[PDB]
Amino acid sequence: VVSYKNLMRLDQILTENRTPTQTTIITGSRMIDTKVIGATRVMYVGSELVPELKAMKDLFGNKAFIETQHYADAGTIMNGEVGSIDKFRIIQVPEMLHWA
Amino acid sequence: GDINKAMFAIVSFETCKADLLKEKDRYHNLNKIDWQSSAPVNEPDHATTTP
Numbered sequence: 001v002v003s004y005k006n007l008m009r010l011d012q013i014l015t016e017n018r019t020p021t022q023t024t025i026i027t028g029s030r031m032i033d034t035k036v037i038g039a040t041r042v043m044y045v046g047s048e049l050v051p052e053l054k055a056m057k058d059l060f061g062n063k064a065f066i067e068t069q070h071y072a073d074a075g076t077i078m079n080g081e082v083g084s085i086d087k088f089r090i091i092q093v094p095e096m097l098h099w100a
Numbered sequence: 101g102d103i104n105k106a107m108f109a110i111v112s113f114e115t116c117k118a119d120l121l122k123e124k125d126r127y128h129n130l131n132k133i134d135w136q137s138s139a140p141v142n143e144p145d146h147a148t149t150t151p
């Protein structure tokens with residue numbers, strides 16, 4: 001099952017490959033209960049992987065999945081987006097395939 | 101076979117935000133488009149000489 005360290009390692013590998021960054025960081029808004037998001041890449045996941053990502057914990061035990069309601073203000077929301085983890089903005093594809 | 105009878109016509113062209121802000125009154129709803137990266141990620145057809 002995926003964990004925080006796997007995402008950090010994937011980001012490190014992509015930085016080594018000199019892959020360009022798709023998007024930019026977001027600075028917070030003035031509204032209460034709004035937090036910054038420093039995610040600069042995009043990830044595609046199926047709809048049935050989302051609960052596991054939501055239950056994910058970071059290195060210090062805090063929540064790792066940040067919902068779009070927090071940073072909808074002072075930022076833009078890509079179509080189909082559900083949240084952000086670490087450097088990645090997670091986009092849910094309804095018809096994503098898998099090996100069974 | 102006569103252009104004056106045509107009911108609709110569609111043209112796809114290339115613009116930047118400066119042209120759209122030339123006339124602020126005419127164009128609305130520009131905030132949704134993300135100009136920080138390529139928000140028209142797809143540009144169907146539009147055969148252009150631009151590399």
